[PDB]
């Protein structure tokens, strides 16, 4: 029933709308152009092509990520650098969401899996990291279930509705 494909420009309107509706961190319109145009942002859509009334190709889940030079990342302190391999990169998950009526079916887990499977194919890509809002227990349980390590708490990381919230840094290293 559920399939995964790269996000493309025809997803632009739906992508912006779903972020506004379910993703707490606000992004500017330029961000969504970056996502659908690719380049330094990789992303995946989840679709149910079995949906009635024409919306078969409309995404019902998404994950967006960007590529980060390992030595420019905030977790560079956690990495053992081997002089012979070069600096390497990291994949940083930016956003992740599933529409409410599709939740608790493993779609978010599968979306994260796509990002990890992607990062493992890039020669010197060292893994995946992200920040989770600290009071978002479902997200914490999800990344833990995917074997991500909860590293540390960052204070005042997020600004949401004019209120500051802490985040947790989560990392999955390909060779931990
Ligand atoms: C930046 C951050 O803070 S991280 C990004 C967080 N994104 C958001 O908060 C956006 C709003 N939230 C969402 O969109 C969603 O709720 C998400 C992305 C957090 C999870 O989406 P889901 O597709 O529901 O994730 P998934 O289905 O893989 O697991 C969710 C729950 O369903 C459960 N589940 C999975 N498959 C099944 C199944 N077949 N039968 C029953 N329960 C199931 C999982 O065990 C989990 O249970 P828990 O809630 O007790 O941990």
Alpha-carbon gap, residue 23 to 32, rounded angstroms: 13
121: domain range? 1-176
Residue nearest to atom 39 of ligand 1 (CA): 105
Please, which experimental method was used?
A: X-ray
Residue 110 CB coordination number (10 Å): 16
| Residues contributing to the annotated binding site | 96, 98, 104-106, 108-109, 133, 136, 141, 145
Count of domains for the chain: 1
Token pair in block for residue 161: 């509705």
CA–CA distances in Å: residue 49 to residues 16, 55, 146: 20, 8, 26
Q: Give 29: exposed, middle or buried? Use CB within 10 Å, 0-12, 13-18, 19+.
A: exposed
CA–CA distances in Å: residue 53 to residues 7, 46, 50, 58: 21, 18, 10, 11
Atom of ligand 1 nearest to the CA of 141: 51
Q: Is the CB of 22 under 6 A from ligand 1?
A: yes
Q: Is the CB of 141 under 6 A from ligand 1?
A: yes
Residue nearest to atom 33 of ligand 1 (CA): 104
CA of 162 to the centre of ligand 1 (A): 26
Token pair in block for residue 96: 């992740």
């Amino acid at each position: 029933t559920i399939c995964f494909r790269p996000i493309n420009p025809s997803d632009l309107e739906r992508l912006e709308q779903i972020h506004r509706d379910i993703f707490p961190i606000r992004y500017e319109s330029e961000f969504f152009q970056n996502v659908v145009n690719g380049g330094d942002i990789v992303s995946w859509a989840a679709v149910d092509r079995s949906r009635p009334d024409g919306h078969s190709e409309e995404l019902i889940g998404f994950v967006t990520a960007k590529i980060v030079l390992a030595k420019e990342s905030e977790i560079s302190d956690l990495i053992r650098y081997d002089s012979s391999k070069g600096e390497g990169t990291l994949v940083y998950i930016l956003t992740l969401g599933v529409v409410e009526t599709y939740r608790k079916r493993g779609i978010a887990k599968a979306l994260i899996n796509e990002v990890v499977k992607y990062s493992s194919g890039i020669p010197v890509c060292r893994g995946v990291y992200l920040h989770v809002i600290a009071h978002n227990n479902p997200a914490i349980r999800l990344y833990k279930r995917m074997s991500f390590r909860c590293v540390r708490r960052l204070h005042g990381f997020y600004l949401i509705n004019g209120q500051h919230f802490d985040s947790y840094l989560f990392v999955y290293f390909i060779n931990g």
